[PDB]
C-alpha cells in the first residue's frame, strides 16, 4: 500500500546476532569463507523476544537504535519477535515456552506484552516491526484436533489479541504469522485462515498498525521457485509467493488491506527436503535473498530474515526433555543441540551455500 514501514528507515541490526556471527566466523578456517561469514552480521534480522529475560536486550536496542540515528540523521528500526504464548508451540513435540495455561499463563503473558510495551514506549523516535507468534494461529486452523491446541485457542486468541491491542498503542508496526504455503497455503486451508485472521484483525478494531501477515518464519520455502520443489505435490500453491497471492485478495474483500514479509534468511537452496513437514536444522540450507523492500510483489512490504540462521531449530538428542523427533530424520542436521544456541557447523553450511553468495 501506501505506507511500508521500511521506507525511510535504516534497520538497526542486532548487536546479538553480530556477536555470535563475529565468533562463528573467527572460527572458520578458510579465510574467504570466514570473510563472508563475518559479513552476515550486517544483514539484518528479527529479535526474538521468546522469554520475558529478553526483555532488557530490548530496552537497550531501542536506546542504542536511537542514539545511533542521533549520530548519523537517520530514523532507525527495530525488528523483533513477540514469541512467548502460553502453551506455546502446541502442535511440536516438545516446547521451550517458559508459560502455561495451567500456571496464570496469559496473566503472566499480559505481564510480559506490558514489559515490553513500556520499554517501547520509552524511545518515541525509534520505529519497531513486530512479528507476532509464530506458530499459533496457524495451529488455530489445521491443528485443532491436537488436544493441547484445542485446549490452548481460547487463551492463544486472547493473548494475541492482547499483544496487537497494547503494542498498537505504542505505534509498533505488526504482522502477524501466518505459517507458509505448505502449512495455510494448501487451497482449501485458504479460507479457514482467512476467516481466523479476518476475525483476530477485527477483535484488536482494525488498527491500521496491524499491517498483515508474515511467512515462512524459521522455515525454508521459496518466495519464486524456478521449479515446484518435490515435497509440495498436490498444493499449487508451491512457493510463498503463490500463497499470498491467494490468500491476500481474501483479506482484501473485507476491506484489510493486508500486506506481507517473508522470511528469506534460510531459503537460498531449493529441494533439500525429504518432506514438507520436516522443518528441524534442514541439512544443506542456505543464506538465501538478503532483506529488501524490492519484493517484487504488490503484496510484499519486505523480505525478511526473521528466524537467525545459525541458531538451532532443536536438539537431535533423545535423552533432552526438549526432544523433537523431527531432529533426527535424514534431512536434519546432527548431531544438533537445543533449540536458539548456536550450531556452528550449520552456520557454515548456509554461508558457503548461500545464494546469492556472498
Known amino acids: 500500500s501506501a505506507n511500508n514501514p521500511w521506507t525511510g528507515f535504516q ?23 570466514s570473510s563472508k561469514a563475518a559479513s552476515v552480521a550486517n544483514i539484518p534480522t528479527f529479535t526474538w523476544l521468546d522469554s520475558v529475560a529478553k526483555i532488557p536486550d530490548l530496552g537497550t536496542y531501542l ?50 506484552i506490558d514489559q515490553i510495551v513500556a520499554q517501547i514506549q520509552q524511545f518515541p523516535d525509534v520505529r519497531v516491526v513486530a512479528v507476532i507468534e509464530p506458530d499459533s494461529l496457524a495451529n488455530l486452523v489445521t491443528n485443532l484436533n491436537v488436544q493441547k491446541c484445542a485446549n490452548a485457542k481460547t487463551t492463544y486468541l486472547a493473548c494475541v489479541n492482547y499483544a496487537l491491542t497494547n503494542l498498537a498503542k505504542v505505534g509498533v508496526y505488526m504482522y502477524m504469522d501466518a505459517g507458509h504455503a505448505g502449512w495455510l497455503g494448501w487451497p482449501a486451508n485458504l479460507s479457514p485462515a482467512a476467516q481466523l ?3 483476530v484483525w477485527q477483535n484488536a478494531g482494525k488498527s491500521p498498525f496491524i499491517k498483515g501477515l508474515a511467512t515462512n518464519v524459521a522455515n525454508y520455502n521459496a518466495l519464486q521457485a524456478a521449479s515446484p520443489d518435490p515435497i509440495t505435490q498436490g498444493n499449487p500453491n508451491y512457493d510463498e509467493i503463490h500463497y499470498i497471492n491467494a490468500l491476500a485478495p481474501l483479506l482484501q474483500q473485507a476491506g484489510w488491506d493486508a500486506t506481507f514479509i517473508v522470511d528469506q534468511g534460510r531459503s537460498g537452496v531449493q529441494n533439500i527436503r525429504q518432506q514438507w513437514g520436516d522443518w528441524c536444522n534442514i541439512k544443506g540450507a542456505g543464506f538465501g535473498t538478503r532483506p529488501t523492500t524490492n519484493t517484487g510483489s504488490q503484496f510484499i512490504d519486505s ?56
Open 11 to 33: 534497520i538497526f541490526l542486532s548487536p546479538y546476532y553480530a556477536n555470535e556471527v563475529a565468533a562463528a566466523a573467527k572460527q572458520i578456517t578458510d579465510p574467504t569463507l
Open 63 to 112: 536506546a542504542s537504535a536511537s542514539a545511533l540515528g542521533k549520530s548519523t540523521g537517520t530514523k532507525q528500526l527495530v525488528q523483533i519477535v513477540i514469541y512467548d504464548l502460553p502453551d506455546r508451540d502446541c502442535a511440536a513435540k516438545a516446547s521451550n515456552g517458559e508459560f502455561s495455561i495451567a500456571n496464570n499463563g496469559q496473566a503472566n503473558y499480559e505481564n510480559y
Open 197 to 199: 485472521f479476518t476475525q
Open 303 to 358: 523480505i525478511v530474515w526473521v528466524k537467525p540462521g545459525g541458531e538451532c531449530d532443536g536438539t537431535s538428542n533423545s535423552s533432552s526433555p526438549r526432544y523433537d523427533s523431527t531432529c533426527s530424520l535424514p534431512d536434519a542436521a546432527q548431531p544438533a543441540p537445543e533449540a536458539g544456541t548456536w550450531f556452528q557447523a550449520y552456520f557454515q553450511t548456509l554461508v558457503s551455500a548461500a545464494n546469492p553468495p556472498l
